[PDB]
Amino acid sequence: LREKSEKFAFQAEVNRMMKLIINSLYKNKEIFLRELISNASDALDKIRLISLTDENALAGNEELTVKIKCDKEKNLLHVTDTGVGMTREELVKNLGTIAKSGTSEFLNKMTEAQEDGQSTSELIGQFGVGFYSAFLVADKVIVTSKHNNDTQHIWESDSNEFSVIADPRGNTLGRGTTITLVLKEEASDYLELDTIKNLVKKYSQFINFPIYVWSSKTKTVWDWELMN
Amino acid sequence: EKFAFQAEVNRMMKLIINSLYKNKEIFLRELISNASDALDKIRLISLTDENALAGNEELTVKIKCDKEKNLLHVTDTGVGMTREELVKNLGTIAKSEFLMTEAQEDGQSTSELIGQFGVGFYSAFLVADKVIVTSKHNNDTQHIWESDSNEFSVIADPRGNTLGRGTTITLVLKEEASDYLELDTIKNLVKKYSQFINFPIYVWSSKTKTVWDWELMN
Ligand SMILES: C#CCCCn1cnc(N)c2nc(Sc3ccc(C)cc3C)nc1-2
Ligand SMILES: C#CCCCn1cnc(N)c2nc(Sc3ccc(C)cc3C)nc1-2
């Protein structure tokens, strides 16, 4: 009938132990920006692949870029991509699932229910590290997104509760996603223009597309500087 | 059965790990970082113990590429490791069936040990098929540890004490990791990972006949 085991499904809490060790993230909090950039690049690859067969895929927004803006006075970091974007359903379900993956009840049992066992595995294997590291540097994450198949919506969470609303400004993105982080007090430095510039350059290996930072050059003029 | 559920959770863990270790060049940041900690440690010892800097006068990190032999060397003049440290400690970080608790020390201190060095060890084996550790601690003779990540051995170094004090990590690089034997690749990776490190870091480099000598990067 089958290949017999035992003890040892209980010894499956090496998984619990491994999840703890991925607390390499506390030691390397700046990885949140690497992940934001990498996920931005993925969302752009995804819409690009779609445009190969769908001539209307890029209609919402012609360009394929990542735009990062610090706002020191308001304590915000924004990372904006013109990639595939996310429907309301994806904001609710898949962020819901991703935020879940850093807990006790989610891991030790499910048990393969009711989503899509392998799809959940892939969702977390890709985005888990990014979501978790963002909440090591931010008290709130706001996700504004526009997918070709839906209207623009805004998801916000403090990691404990979330809400989603239709964006009352309508479609300002054209298509794509803005991730806005309200930074923790200790994460002050990510509001600095130099710091952000140097991190973007350090992680440009993880983008297949132009990445700009809103930056000043001397009145002093502000514009998008191309980082790669 | 849940055998299938567990198998899927297994696969998710692998994907998370891959995601975490998206950047393989990180192995060198960790090696340099461990070297800085070794140096930090013997310096703290030196404040109270006048013979801490007896084996080796200086406090440096030295990196050498041996292209012909396919080797990367990272040498610190830090605290070093005893034979006991090499056997007991590196064995644990390698094995991170044996996953009751409180073994086999200080298991706050096990978590601490895997915690501090685990990442450097995993990232090493992402770019290398073999890791060789030559270490000389003030309280032991020089020893050489070697692993392919599955099994390890340790021997007294037949060359005696050639380091004075400290540790050389030698990597036998994977075929695809060849680029890390290039001078310009390593130089740039050092300058990329040298902010925190206050100790001098050197790379074995050449300048035009060509003169091979240590070059300060930070
Ligand atoms: C790419 C792709 C396809 C899937 C949808 N999608 C599209 N664009 C992004 N930028 C995404 N980021 C996430 S997860 C995520 C991770 C961390 C944080 C802080 C926020 C989010 C939304 N999911 C994303
Ligand atoms: C610092 C300190 C104190 C403890 C002893 N010790 C001293 N010097 C080093 N350079 C160390 N590296 C490790 S772990 C390690 C991690 C990755 C790899 C590839 C090899 C090893 C031995 N342990 C080390």
Coordinates of C-alpha atoms in Angstrom, one line a residue, chain B residues 60-207:
Chain B
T60 CA 43.3 42.4 10.2
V61 CA 41.1 40.6 7.7
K62 CA 42.9 39.2 4.7
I63 CA 41.2 37.9 1.5
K64 CA 43.1 35.9 -1.2
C65 CA 41.8 34.3 -4.4
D66 CA 43.6 31.2 -5.8
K67 CA 42.1 30.9 -9.3
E68 CA 44.3 28.0 -10.4
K69 CA 43.3 25.8 -7.4
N70 CA 39.7 27.3 -7.4
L71 CA 40.0 28.6 -3.8
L72 CA 38.8 31.6 -1.9
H73 CA 40.6 32.4 1.4
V74 CA 39.3 34.6 4.2
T75 CA 41.9 35.0 7.0
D76 CA 41.4 36.9 10.3
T77 CA 43.9 37.5 13.1
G78 CA 41.0 37.2 15.6
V79 CA 40.2 34.9 18.6
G80 CA 40.5 31.6 16.7
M81 CA 38.9 28.3 17.7
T82 CA 40.2 25.4 19.8
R83 CA 39.9 21.8 18.5
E84 CA 36.9 21.4 20.9
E85 CA 35.2 24.5 19.3
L86 CA 35.9 23.1 15.8
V87 CA 34.4 19.7 16.6
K88 CA 31.5 20.6 18.8
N89 CA 30.4 24.0 17.4
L90 CA 30.8 23.7 13.6
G91 CA 29.1 20.3 13.8
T92 CA 26.0 21.9 15.2
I93 CA 25.8 24.7 12.6
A94 CA 26.1 22.0 10.0
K95 CA 23.2 20.0 11.5
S96 CA 20.8 22.9 11.7
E97 CA 17.1 13.5 13.1
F98 CA 18.4 15.4 16.2
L99 CA 16.6 18.7 15.6
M100 CA 13.9 16.4 25.0
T101 CA 15.9 19.7 25.0
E102 CA 18.9 21.3 26.8
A103 CA 21.5 19.6 24.7
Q104 CA 24.3 19.8 24.3
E105 CA 25.0 23.0 26.1
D106 CA 23.7 26.1 27.1
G107 CA 20.8 26.0 24.6
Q108 CA 20.0 29.5 24.8
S109 CA 23.6 29.2 23.6
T110 CA 22.9 26.7 20.9
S111 CA 20.2 29.0 19.5
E112 CA 22.7 31.8 19.9
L113 CA 25.4 29.8 18.0
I114 CA 23.2 28.8 15.1
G115 CA 21.7 32.4 15.3
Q116 CA 25.1 34.2 14.9
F117 CA 26.8 31.9 12.4
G118 CA 24.1 29.8 10.7
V119 CA 23.6 32.3 7.9
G120 CA 27.3 32.5 7.1
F121 CA 27.5 28.7 7.0
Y122 CA 24.5 28.2 4.8
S123 CA 25.5 30.9 2.3
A124 CA 29.0 29.4 2.2
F125 CA 27.6 26.1 1.0
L126 CA 25.5 27.9 -1.6
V127 CA 28.7 28.9 -3.4
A128 CA 31.2 26.1 -2.3
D129 CA 31.3 22.3 -2.3
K130 CA 33.8 22.2 0.5
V131 CA 34.6 24.4 3.4
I132 CA 38.0 24.1 5.2
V133 CA 38.6 26.0 8.4
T134 CA 42.2 26.4 9.7
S135 CA 42.2 27.9 13.2
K136 CA 44.6 28.7 16.0
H137 CA 43.2 29.9 19.4
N138 CA 45.5 31.1 22.1
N139 CA 44.8 27.9 24.2
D140 CA 45.3 25.3 21.5
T141 CA 47.6 24.2 18.6
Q142 CA 46.6 24.9 15.0
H143 CA 43.9 22.6 13.7
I144 CA 42.1 22.1 10.3
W145 CA 38.4 21.3 10.0
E146 CA 36.8 20.3 6.7
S147 CA 33.3 19.6 5.5
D148 CA 31.2 18.9 2.4
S149 CA 28.2 19.9 4.6
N150 CA 27.2 16.2 5.1
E151 CA 30.2 14.9 7.0
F152 CA 33.2 16.5 8.7
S153 CA 36.7 15.7 10.0
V154 CA 39.3 17.5 12.0
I155 CA 43.1 17.1 12.3
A156 CA 45.9 18.8 14.0
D157 CA 47.6 20.9 11.3
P158 CA 50.9 19.2 10.4
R159 CA 52.3 22.6 9.4
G160 CA 52.2 23.7 13.1
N161 CA 51.2 27.3 13.9
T162 CA 51.4 29.3 10.7
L163 CA 48.6 31.8 11.5
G164 CA 50.0 33.0 14.8
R165 CA 46.4 33.5 16.0
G166 CA 43.1 33.4 14.2
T167 CA 41.2 31.7 11.4
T168 CA 41.4 31.0 7.7
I169 CA 38.1 30.0 6.0
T170 CA 38.9 28.3 2.7
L171 CA 36.2 27.7 0.2
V172 CA 36.4 25.1 -2.6
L173 CA 34.1 27.0 -5.0
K174 CA 31.3 25.5 -7.1
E175 CA 31.8 25.6 -10.9
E176 CA 29.1 28.3 -11.2
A177 CA 30.8 30.4 -8.4
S178 CA 33.9 30.9 -10.5
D179 CA 33.4 34.7 -10.8
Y180 CA 34.3 35.0 -7.1
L181 CA 37.9 34.1 -8.1
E182 CA 38.1 37.3 -10.1
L183 CA 40.0 40.2 -8.5
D184 CA 37.5 42.9 -9.6
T185 CA 34.5 40.9 -8.4
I186 CA 36.0 40.5 -4.9
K187 CA 37.3 44.0 -4.6
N188 CA 33.8 45.4 -5.3
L189 CA 32.2 42.9 -2.9
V190 CA 34.4 44.1 -0.1
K191 CA 33.7 47.8 -0.7
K192 CA 30.1 46.8 -0.9
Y193 CA 30.3 45.2 2.6
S194 CA 32.7 47.4 4.7
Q195 CA 30.7 50.0 6.5
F196 CA 30.2 48.3 9.9
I197 CA 33.7 46.8 9.9
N198 CA 36.2 49.1 11.7
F199 CA 39.2 46.7 11.4
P200 CA 41.4 46.9 8.3
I201 CA 40.4 44.6 5.4
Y202 CA 42.9 43.6 2.7
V203 CA 42.7 41.9 -0.6
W204 CA 45.6 40.1 -2.3
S205 CA 46.0 42.3 -5.5
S206 CA 48.4 43.2 -8.2
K207 CA 49.6 46.5 -9.7

